Amino acid sequence: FNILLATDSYKVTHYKQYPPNTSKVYSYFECREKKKYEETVFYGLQYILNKYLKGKVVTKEKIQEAKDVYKEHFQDDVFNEKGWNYILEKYDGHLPIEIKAVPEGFVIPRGNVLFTVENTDPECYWLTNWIETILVQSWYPITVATNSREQKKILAKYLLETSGNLDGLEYKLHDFGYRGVSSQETAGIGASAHLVNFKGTDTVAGLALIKKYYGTKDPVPGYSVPAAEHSTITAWGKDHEKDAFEHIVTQFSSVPVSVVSDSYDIYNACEKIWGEDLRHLIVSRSTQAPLIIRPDSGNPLDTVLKVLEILGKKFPVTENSKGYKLLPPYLRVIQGDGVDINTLQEIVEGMKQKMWSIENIAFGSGGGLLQKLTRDLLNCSFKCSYVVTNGLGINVFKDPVADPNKRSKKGRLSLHRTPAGNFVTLEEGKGDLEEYGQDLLHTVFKNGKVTKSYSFDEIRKNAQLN
Amino acid sequence: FNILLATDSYKVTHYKQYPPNTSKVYSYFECREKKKYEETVFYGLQYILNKYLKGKVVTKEKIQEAKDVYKEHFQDDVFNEKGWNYILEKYDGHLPIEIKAVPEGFVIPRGNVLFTVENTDPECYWLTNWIETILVQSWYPITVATNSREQKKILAKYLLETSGNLDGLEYKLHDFGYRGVSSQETAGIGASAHLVNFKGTDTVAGLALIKKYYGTKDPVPGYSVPAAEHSTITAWGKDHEKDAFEHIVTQFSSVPVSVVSDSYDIYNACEKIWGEDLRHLIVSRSTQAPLIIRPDSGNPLDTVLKVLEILGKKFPVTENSKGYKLLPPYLRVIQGDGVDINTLQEIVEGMKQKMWSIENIAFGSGGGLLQKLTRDLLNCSFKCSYVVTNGLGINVFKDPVADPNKRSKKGRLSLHRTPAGNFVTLEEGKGDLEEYGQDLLHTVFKNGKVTKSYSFDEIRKNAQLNI
Ligand SMILES: O=C(Nc1ccc(C2=NNC(=O)[C@@](c3cccc4ncccc34)(C(F)(F)F)C2)cc1)N1Cc2ccncc2C1
Ligand SMILES: O=C(Nc1ccc(C2=NNC(=O)[C@@](c3cccc4ncccc34)(C(F)(F)F)C2)cc1)N1Cc2ccncc2C1
């Protein structure tokens, strides 16, 4: 990794574009309000600070590699070799940058300052926005954590309504997304962001990221159970689906086991194979080791409702203290196909209308959870708000005539508690009036060192639901 | 990197679920047809083979790390330590796997085998599908290359129609997506996939990936020009936008230079600042060093058409030999906001209806090009189609009653040219009847070695448009 090659090409040319005698560039990150995701989990900057920004990030060799690449890339010698040599010689390759940030896991309304960046040496005025590209990739862990939290809110509401408690809430949305993301690095970041809110993952890459960058008191931040795939059922042959199911639930007799049941006919598998031929191997299992039947095709709501209606007529169903139907504790369902925040809401509402407890169901989500998200969903954006030029500070901003939603904030920013205990971003250095007490941003990075950090356990606490 | 920790958790348990006495698992990858992205660029597998699958990928230390993690993760000791030790001791940690693939850059219709995977040692029947998760991530470079190519087709059609050639086609869609992707690793892979079809990138990460994994005869696979951002304009102050523009075009007098012009009022910047106050610094510039005006907000079609209407009244417009209007060569426009395959089509059709040449415009795309894509867009999917159990081969598949589109192929697969020059995937080992040409799948990986590689130059040639 070479930070000289980890910016948008055009930023290589910015040191020639700022007003002459500019000693300070001060820039901020927000999830811009779009005058429905009203609050965001701030998570993921600490990963970036440690993996990419801290310590000696400049060497002789990195400067020469970048020089040689940019000469060809631009067909011209526009690279700031002198500016990067300055950092190597004055600071042993440590970035003279100060970043202030809201604590990780914090849950903040749209349109607030989340972090700020500024150069600490006048010579490095160009450096603040060099690192915009790398820091703005924060959008991804923020957006995965936020969208996973919104899904937890829906699950919380319906589980509380149909059961009278939240037992098992943190295992209700399992991460199926490892194959469905764009890379290994993405797998680990996105899986880690989902584990801010839940404990169930198949995306193994998330576990090592958490242990190296954040830390947990527990040995691991997330858990799984044995489960089949189409290959482990269909490999027995089209006439032997029963043989496959029997061998798998017998191999995994004393732990929970998920068994994909839609290879040929989900409704026949539920009613005849599980519900009649193999019923004796299901009703014997312990409460700690249920069979989880997994449909994987068809309309997600219609399929879930028919699977439950089938199982309800083959297995002894109870009515819980809320009046909702409940499968025996040895038998559960997981819908792991077509789940995103919209279909999840549809399935739990539909279950509730048919008097099925959300105790009966778990969800798996892959692309919906980790991939089908963009920087646009929360308007994650980094902008310059303040510069010093000829020793005078100026409040700077954009305000495009055709889109007032892209207006940016002015001047030096701070984050405060309101008298009602909400959040407000103060602009134009007005935080210094101290009419709203102390800035909630903390210095997290300064002059190549991480100065403040959060365990994963602290992050989970900050991100809890009301 | 530990390949023992680079699979979906449940696959750690699959070695206990396959039929006993199974000596072979054979699986394939396709972009399943949904019975419109009718053809897919196969690109990206070579990166995965070299970065993650080749050489000694198993050590004593990796097996113990995986053992310790899976113990806690499953609350149980279900990990296949003996199976992974077998690979370490018999093959010095090299995977006994054979992968066959269509050549990279090939352009293949939906619903065809692109690559196959099978174990070369009976002991390692479980290994074929262990590596499903890592191989299925090839969806991403395939889908970025495919979607970038479909955009090149749209640009090709409209540029040929409004100008009578394709000059500059390979610079018409610039990658703006570095900040808009989910990771550094993703930036490099997605940027490299876009450069299969175009030469203009700001996503620097793509250049080193191409040089390390593919290689080009040219020094670099992709190029950029100097350009402003809101910070380099707004830093001058709200009352000095004109000073910022003047200093920037004067700093970059002799090369092309893109200047974001919507900080306060794009229409005032075009009509009064560029079109009157600074016009003398624009009309002097060379054909090799145009000013590119960059709007960055509003309705993308409406804003492009009004920018061109303004510039057409302040600058000398010509009518090209097709009847379409053309800005002077020192002046161009780039729309780099809200561009995806749908808005791109809308803008060029709108320009065509208003008699503007596509010569006037370049596009920048960020999230649309590199991030707003999923494995579902081309139904990229990996399935087991053949096993050997008790020495007998059987053709296996799924065929869910409620979704016939998820039906999978049966048996040993091969890819062939049809008598009309199309493609066909043969099932059930029917390739061995040799009623069609050679199988187009080549061994690219075997027993821990990459056996066949493609230069990036070969991939660009394979992925060219017809015309
Ligand atoms: O079906 C898959 N995995 C799976 C299925 C169900 C659950 C459960 N979630 N939630 C729960 O509460 C269960 C559960 C009960 C008791 C103790 C559990 N311990 C740890 C966690 C879950 C526990 C419930 F059985 F009670 F539903 C089980 C977890 C994972 N697959 C993995 C995968 C990956 C990629 N693509 C497809 C698939 C299929
Ligand atoms: O505007 C940006 N960059 C940029 C702008 C225009 C082009 C051109 N594209 N296509 C071309 O044909 C141009 C062009 C002509 C002549 C020689 C060129 N040489 C190399 C390539 C482009 C050449 C055209 F001037 F003719 F339009 C110029 C390339 C990059 N930005 C970079 C960026 C990154 C992230 N976010 C926002 C931005 C803004």
From Swiss-Prot, chain B:
InterPro entries: Aldolase_TIM, DUF5598, N/Namide_PRibTrfase, Nicotinamide_PRibTrfase, Nicotinate_pribotase-like_C. Beta-nicotinamide D-ribonucleotide binds at residues 202, 294-296, 336-337, 367, 375. Expressed in large amounts in bone marrow, liver tissue, and muscle. Also present in heart, placenta, lung, and kidney tissues. It is an enzyme of class 2 (transferase). One of its GO terms (cellular component) is cytosol. It is found in: Nucleus; Cytoplasm; Secreted. Keywords: Acetylation, Biological rhythms, Cytokine, Cytoplasm, Glycosyltransferase, Nucleus, Phosphoprotein, Pyridine nucleotide biosynthesis, Secreted, Transferase. Inhibited by FK866. FK866 competes for the same binding site as nicotinamide, but due to its very low dissociation rate, it is essentially an irreversible inhibitor. It comes from the Eukaryota. Changing residue 159 to S: In a colorectal cancer sample; somatic mutation. Pathway: Cofactor biosynthesis; NAD(+) biosynthesis; nicotinamide D-ribonucleotide from 5-phospho-alpha-D-ribose 1-diphosphate and nicotinamide: step 1/1. One of its GO terms (biological process) is positive regulation of transcription by RNA polymerase II. Catalyzes the condensation of nicotinamide with 5-phosphoribosyl-1-pyrophosphate to yield nicotinamide mononucleotide, an intermediate in the biosynthesis of NAD. It is the rate limiting component in the mammalian NAD biosynthesis pathway. The secreted form behaves both as a cytokine with immunomodulating properties and an adipokine with anti-diabetic properties, it has no enzymatic activity, partly because of lack of activation by ATP, which has a low level in extracellular space and plasma. Plays a role in the modulation of circadian clock function. Belongs to the NAPRTase family. This is Nicotinamide phosphoribosyltransferase. It comes from Homo sapiens.
